[PDB]
Design a protein around this ligand. Structure first.
Ligand SMILES: Nc1ncnc2c1ncn2[C@@H]1O[C@H](COP(=O)(O)O)[C@@H](O)[C@H]1O
Ligand SMILES: Nc1ncnc2c1ncn2[C@@H]1O[C@H](COP(=O)(O)O)[C@@H](O)[C@H]1O
Lengths: 143, 143
């Protein structure tokens, strides 16, 4: 009773039916942090894909990013774009932002662990949002 | 419209009424990972204080810790204690595990950001659990 079972690890996200693929809440690179703050508190989601003018995912903005902004010693207000979080980290260029439905659970779990991130955005061939896979999604499938 | 407002940052957790102080789900240092996995999926909480034989908090076990276990290349099963997560990180010795009600939001936010952790356990003078403060708790108060 290996954990995880090898047969699970070799299956794809699509095969295991892992992730959320409807009603995804997301923002734009030009969205102010106040908009994200309001979504997090009132809509109750943990992270928001951030898309460019073409609809392509370039970041994911999380509750922790807001707290990190709050801790900055320099003066900020909430009118700053969510892209200021990119000064702290680049999920995009580290290859720990996106995934595809055909990737295996082994690949997804290793990518999450590589950068200690808690979700990935599932995208299409144009880097447009199809869904989100979070640690909760993976745990549900493991049981 | 500084973010966060300085008057918020100077107030304590108790003053701002931030955190969960009832119905805290928690485990022991001798608890197997399978028990934690079942709590995470069925009880739907994000992290679990881990307490020793005296009831004192010595770690906090999170969904990410399970995923980190899953990614280990060595052979594991779920009968291993939750304390195996301590091979990867020590929240305790880094001083990023616990907090007190009288600490300021500035102190709490800086401690969360220091180690990039998403919650702290609120404890008493004996390191026994009183509650949990997570990023969601802090955001609710910021709005
Ligand atoms: N931006 C989002 N929009 C919709 N669902 C989301 C979003 N972020 C996470 N989820 C889903 O919310 C559930 C809980 O995720 P987690 O908050 O990370 O515990 C999972 O099924 C995620 O796939
Ligand atoms: N082990 C736990 N038992 C009870 N409440 C918890 C626990 N962990 C987190 N919470 C609370 O669950 C809510 C959502 O936290 P978060 O999952 O981190 O978004 C917050 O009000 C936390 O204080």
């Amino acid at each position: 009773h290996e954990f995880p079972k090898p047969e699970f690890m070799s299956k794809s996200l699509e095969e295991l039916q892992i992730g959320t693929y409807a009603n995804i809440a997301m923002v734009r690179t030009t969205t102010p942090v106040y908009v994200a703050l309001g979504i997090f508190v009132q809509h109750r989601v943990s992270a928001l894909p951030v898309v460019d003018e073409k609809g392509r995912v370039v970041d994911i903005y999380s509750k922790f990013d807001v707290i990190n902004l709050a801790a900055e010693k320099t003066y900020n207000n909430l009118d700053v774009s969510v892209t200021k979080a990119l000064q702290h980290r680049s999920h995009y260029f580290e290859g720990v932002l996106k995934c595809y439905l055909h990737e295996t659970l082994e690949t997804i779990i290793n990518r999450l662990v590589e950068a200690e991130v808690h979700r990935l955005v599932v995208v299409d061939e144009n880097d447009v949002v199809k869904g989100i896979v979070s640690l909760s999604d993976i745990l549900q499938a493991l049981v």
